[PDB]
Every structure is written in structure tokens, then in C-alpha cells.
Amino acid sequence: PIETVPVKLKPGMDGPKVKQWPLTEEKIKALVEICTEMEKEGKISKIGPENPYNTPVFAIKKKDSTKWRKLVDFRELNKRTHPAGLKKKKSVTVLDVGDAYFSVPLDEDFRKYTAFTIPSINNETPGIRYQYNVLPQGWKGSPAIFQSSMTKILEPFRKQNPDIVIYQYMDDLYVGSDLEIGQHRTKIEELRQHLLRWGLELHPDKWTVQPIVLPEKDSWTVNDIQKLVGKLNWASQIYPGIKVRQLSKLLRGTKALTEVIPLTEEAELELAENREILKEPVHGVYYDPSKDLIAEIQKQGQGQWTYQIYQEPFKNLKTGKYARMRGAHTNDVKQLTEAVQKITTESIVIWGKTPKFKLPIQKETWETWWTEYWQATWIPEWEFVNTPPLVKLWYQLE
């Protein structure tokens, strides 16, 4: 019925050929139930092995609902295929409008690139493969093709509410308002009822930055000054105003680490001036949409996680921290997955783009459990790094 739009790949790039990873029994049973209903409704069709492409798939179950959400890891296909006032609203609600993509057909010559495989427990059966006939959820081209149809749906609601910003990214709809809690949720329900005519909770105001802080002591040892000098020396790469001349001359000689060193008047003021320079904003940092956002995370212990967002070295666009429970049953991997989801969400609100993460975790450790704590519809790109304990120390807190 609806006319399709031709979509192609980048020049010199083939389709994705990523293997399927092991899936638990509950995810496989959920995917089989979902795929049968998607196949009955013409959304997907079975394919054979002559299609050489494949994309991994899994499923997430949101907290309090027996509903499962099919997630396709399309970030390899996406590689091969902004409202500034949004970050200033009291409340921003994220709506999952991925089901709206199933009403638009997909280009016939592109469907072979959406291939995925449903595994079986204990390899009872060979993998059973499918491909998409409509706009798939989590694909880069789905919001672009549906963009014209999305504006027609939101046009009356946007005109009736001019002070409400509605931003779309992937299968998500970000709706922010300055209304009071209660009036905001009532307005969100109006939007959901507005979306049902066609078919078929954040607070950016409280987002803060974590600046670099220096220790405050009455008695300083050689070791204290050596650690402070090393931290300021690294900080000078970000803040060129940082000086360490008067603090370094206190360390002349070959002294014991536990020897107490009195701070001179010049060194005392040099430390006080350095505290003011760290409070000033970083100079000359301009966002580049053509470049990728890079997010580094450092595990600080006791449930504390620091992160920085940049595109060039020492050109931080944002520095924050992420604290959680400090109990004994702490799951480092679970906390790390919650951290990357919050960092990605902030990057989508501020810049409308997902960052590339440098994760401080073994590759095997992450891939084994990260899908067990994922709740978003998108998946950022990431790499694994052996972080030196130096950058971990520089963003520490007292």
C-alpha cells in the first residue's frame, strides 16, 4: 500500500555479519513468542542460509510487567547504513514509540541486511533466521523515514502546547515540560492517547557537574605533597593556569614520605589560587557533530563512578559522577550498565547523539551479564580498556 523509499549502504561497505551470542531460556521463549506474532502480522519473514548477513538479537523485561521487549543490536548496520531547551525542563518523560515503525514497509533490496537468528537451548535445533519487512526498531533509518509521518501526528499536540519540547531519538520520544508533577504526568497521558488515535522519568534541571577538587589538610607530609603535585601536573593539561612551582620546591632533597612539611606563604596561596582555577569553566571546548562523543568511566569504589565526556583529549564537554548503594551485595557490572545508560541518556538530551564508551571491565565479563541489566531501546558503541590508576586518582573525592 504505502510507497517504499530506497535505502542503500555506504560506498564500499557490506552488510553486518555478527554472530549471535548465547541467550537464556526465558529470553529465547520470549523471542519465539514475539517472532510468531510478528510473522503472523507480516512484520518479519523466515529466511535461509543463502542470506550471508546476521545481526544479534535478545530481549529485555522491564521491571513490573510480564511484557518482553525485543532488542536487535543494529549498531553495526547503523554504522554501515537539536532542541537546546530540552535539557532545561523540570521533568522529561521517555516514551517508547517503536511499535509505530511497523506500519511502514521497508525497501525490498534492503531487507536482507536486517537478518537475525533465534538460537535454541542446548542446540536442539539449528538457528532459525528471519528478516524484516517493515521499519525495524533500533535501526538508524527508521526514525528518518518515519520523520514526516511523526510530525503530522505531533502537530496538533505541539501547537496546543508550545512550551513542551518533544524530541525523538531512535525508538524513544523525549517530552519535557516545566509543569508541576501531576500536571506533567496528566499531560503525558494525553500524548499517549494522542498516539493511540493513529496506532498501533528524567529531571535535567538537577543534572550537575563534578569539578576537580583538591584536598584540605592542616598537616602535609612529603607523600601528601607528592600526590598533590602529580594531580596538579595532570590538571594543567586541562587548566593551563595551574602552577606547581612553589609546591615543588618544598620537595627539594631526598626526604621520607611521612616527614611533615610546613606550607610556606607562597605555596599556601599557590594552592588557594589553584582551587579557584579548577572552579572556572574549561575554555575553548566546542561540540563537533561530525566527530564522535567519547565517554570514559572510572570505578572509584564504594559504589562511586566518575565519568567524562569529550571529543578531543583534555577537552571535556561534561564531567560528572554516579553514586549508588554502598552495601555488601554490590554488583559492579550491574552498576556499570546503569551508569552507561544514564550517561548515554544525558548525551542524547544534551547533544542528540550516543557516545562511544571506554569501559573499565574485561570484555568477557561485560558481554556475559550486560544484557541482564539493560533497559533502554538503544545500544551505544563501546570498547574495553585497561585503565591506569592515575586517571582514577585525579577524579577521586574525599
Next chain:
Amino acid sequence: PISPIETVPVKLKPGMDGPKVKQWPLTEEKIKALVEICTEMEKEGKISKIGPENPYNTPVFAIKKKDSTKWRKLVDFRELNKRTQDFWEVQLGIPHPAGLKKKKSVTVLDVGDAYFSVPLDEDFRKYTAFTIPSINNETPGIRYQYNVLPQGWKGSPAIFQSSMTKILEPFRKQNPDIVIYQYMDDLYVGSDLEIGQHRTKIEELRQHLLRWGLTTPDKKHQKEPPFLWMGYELHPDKWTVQPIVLPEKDSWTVNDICKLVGKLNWASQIYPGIKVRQLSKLLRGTKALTEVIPLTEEAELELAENREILKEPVHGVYYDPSKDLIAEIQKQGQGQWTYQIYQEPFKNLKTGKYARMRGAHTNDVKQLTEAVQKITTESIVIWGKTPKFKLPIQKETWETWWTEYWQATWIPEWEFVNTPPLVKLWYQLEKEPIVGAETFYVDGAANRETKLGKAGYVTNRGRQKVVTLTDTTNQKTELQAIYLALQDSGLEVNIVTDSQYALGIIQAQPDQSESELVNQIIEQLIKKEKVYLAWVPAHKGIGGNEQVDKLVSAGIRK
């Protein structure tokens, strides 16, 4: 017969043509077997005679089957496989008997001439041309092409596996409570029915497969235990691996070690305590398979204890989803680990081992975490869930490790078992400088051209020493300086270095390393009672880092 299922469309790679390889000479015995097979396949339409309009050819040969009485027609399609399109393999792994659930009735059967019953794409058939010689000048060689899947072609396994799945799909939908383990053409069928009603359903399955052109000869129709399946023996309430025979040579070659370690890894799935570290080390630096290799004392001893394990009777049980999955891990030396997965004590579902060495420097806690992750992924494949663990590490030891470790690490639900050797950290670095300990300022420096270097220290108590080095690197000299300070210091020492490379290695608390220098450092760290390691930026005039830097740079820098 030939299955009425639709063919899978297959193309060649762009700008490619079919193979043109002439037949190599064959034994008279093999020629007699091939002509008997091909005259019958030609009568059934599975192959078709071709004339001069087909310019292609590919060599053929034959080997014995597992029955040892029948022959298997093979084709050396190596050239056509290079020119055939890519496929996505649908076979994601191998089924394991430990994942089988208890069934009331069990049947194992096999399809006769499985490949030769699935039709091949008509446009691709000409590329499968082959020639069969005969009696010379009394009847010349006959040329054929394949109308069915050939044995030797790249696309045959995935096409058959996908076609077999489509064929079984109507039966599975009609009988969702009858489990059919489908590996190639080999079918394990289990039900919770009485043996009478079960065999009637088996005949429904055999009739269903026959309707889709797949015969099930009674010769390969197993009806009583033990069932021979996938290299195992399936009893009603237990399973075992078919007898494994290790080679018993007095002069082992690389190929002999390959088949030795291969059968040991295969045995480790049910035989506990298998080790292959010393036998696998003998393969380093080797070139060809014919390389005879002398066995070391450790390798000779490792094989001896492996042979004694294989003499004991062992078996596994089947999976009960109403019980928990338990994985207990035992430590052996040299980065080797073994584990037993069970639901009831002393009733192993399966066993295994983990001995992969990750990283140049590591400790027993890292390797244990890596083994837990390997068993977790393996358990999700076989049983679809994560097991509960029984680990030989104290809760306090783990709490200390992941508190100070900069990376995120986690172990699922587990408890401690006192089965030595226990996993522990062999030393801990202090968090604060040590009062009353001598403070060493260490540094190393090396010349890139001459490869000469110096390592040394200066102390707050007036001591200093410089050691010259030959054929070294800047990283090695910094490690040599730390090693020197550990040798000449007391039981408690403060060490200040400018090398984050050496700092990161020591902060991870390794107990084993590929570097002998690092191993020497580890032995020093274990003997100390308190060690504090601090870092300062190099070339910043900080004392006494400036003093030692000026000491080790003289004569190799500037």
C-alpha cells in the same frame, strides 16, 4: 526418493566461473564402488548425465563409512567452494547430553542418504560436474552432474540443516511436547508417553519424514538402551562417553601431541581433573606436524596422571529443571582449573577444565573470575540459565580484591568450599606511606640506539646504587630499579617511581608472569611485610626523583 521441498537459490561470486579440475586416478575398488553408487543415483534422478555442453569438472573419491561396509561418495569441491557465495551457518553449536531432560521413552534414528534426498538449485547444478572412469576402452568414463546436495560442497551443511528444520516444523507444531534433537540428519526423539503410544508417534514422524522424501531405515533405528548418539551412550538414567583410546607411542610427534591433547579435551567433559598445560607447552615454536618432540619431566608426569584418571569408570546424569545448577571449581597449578557441574552431590551432569592464560601478568583471583565467566556462558548454552557456584576462595579474600581493583568485576551467587589449594592474594600494597620504613626513589633509563641502560635508587637515609644493563628497554630498566630496591631494603619499604607502566603491573597484585624479572619481583613482594608504592611525574625536578634520574641517565642519555 527426492524431497519435494523448494531448492535454496545459490549463486557464484561475481566474476567467477565453475571449476575445471581433472579427475585423479582412483583405486579399482573405489571405482567399482562409485559406479555402483552412481548408476543407482542416476536411476533415481539424483544425478544426471551430461555431454560436451558442460565444460566443468571436479575430482571425486570415496572413503568408508562408520558401518565400514558401505562407501561414501565425496567430491573435492575446494575450487568451487572458493568461488561460491558466502552463507550464514545456522548450526550454532553441539548438543550435549547433560542438557537432556529425563524422558519416559527415547528413540534415536538416522536418515538414509540424507544429502542425496535434498534437491539442488537447478541453475547451480552444472558447476557440480564430475567424471567417473571405468574399464579402459571397453566402456569410457561417464560424466554426471548433481541434482541433489553433494558431499564436499561448502553450502551443503547449512542448506541441509535449514531444510531439515523446515521439514520438521509441521511435526514440531503438531507435537510441541515431543523433543527432537536435530543434528544434521541424526534425530534424538523423546516423549513422556508409554512405550506403546511413543512408538506410534515415532511412526507418525517416520511417515512425516517420508512424505518429505527422507527415509528412516530400520538399520539405523535404535529402539532400546543404551542409545548410541553423538559419540555417547544414552542409558535411561545416565550417560557415558564412548571409549576413548589414547595413543601409546614411545616417540611423540607434533601430530601425536595434537591428537593426544584433542582426546584429552574431549575426555575432560566427564572425566574430572584433566590437565594439558605441560603437553600443550611442547607445541610452542614448532613448525610441522612431523616434528618429533622429547617429553619433559612435567609433560611425562602430566600424561601419567591423565592415564590413571581415564581408567576409572565415570558417567553423567540428565538435567532436572526443578533443581538448582551447581558448579564447583577446583584449582590446579600453572593456571589450570577443573570444575564439576551437578544438581545433587556426587552426581555430575558434566565436568570441564579452564586453563587459558590471559595477560602477561595475572593472579589466581583473576583466573578464577575468568573460569566463572566461561562456565557461566557454557551453562547458558546447555541449560539456558546461570549456575550457583562453589568456589575455593574466602569471602574476605574476594571482598578485598574487588574493593581495590580498578576494573569492574563480579561473581554470581556463590559460597566458599574448603578444598585446597585455596585461592588467596599473596601480598597487599599499603594505602598509606609506612612510618619507619626507608624511602627509596627508584628510576630506570635506557638508550634506544645502543640498548644500554641503568637502574638504581636513592634513599632518604643516604644510600644509593646504580646497576648497568645490556640489551634492555626503558620499561625493563624501570622494573629493574623496583627489583633492586626490594632486594636492598628491609621488611618494610617505601618506593617512589615515575613509571606508571611498572606501577600498573604491581598494583594488580600478580602472582605469576611470563616475565622472569616480574616473577623475581613477585617473590620479593611476598617476602615483605609492608610495601608502599607511590608515583610522581618524571622530569619535574621532584626530589629525590631528580637525584636518581640524574644518576641513571648519566652515560646513556644527553
Next chain:
DNA sequence: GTCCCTGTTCGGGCGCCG
């Protein structure tokens, strides 16, 4: 930039199964 060191990935041999 180069040199060094450490990480992952791919392909080679063998094992096992059809």
C-alpha cells in the same frame, strides 16, 4: 614520528559430531 608492551582477532593444526 619510533620503539616497546599489551591487548584482541583471525587462521592454522588437531579433537569430536554428522
Next chain:
DNA sequence: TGGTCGGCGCCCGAACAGGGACTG
């Protein structure tokens, strides 16, 4: 006597990529 194909497993070495230290 070999000599074919695909899957998974193992361990090995070759060929990368990424980051720190270095020359003048």
C-alpha cells in the same frame, strides 16, 4: 595410503590496534 564439507572445542603464532616514553 590419502585427498572433501560445516559446526563446536582446544592451543598456538601472525598481524594487527592503542598508549606511554623517548630525541633534540
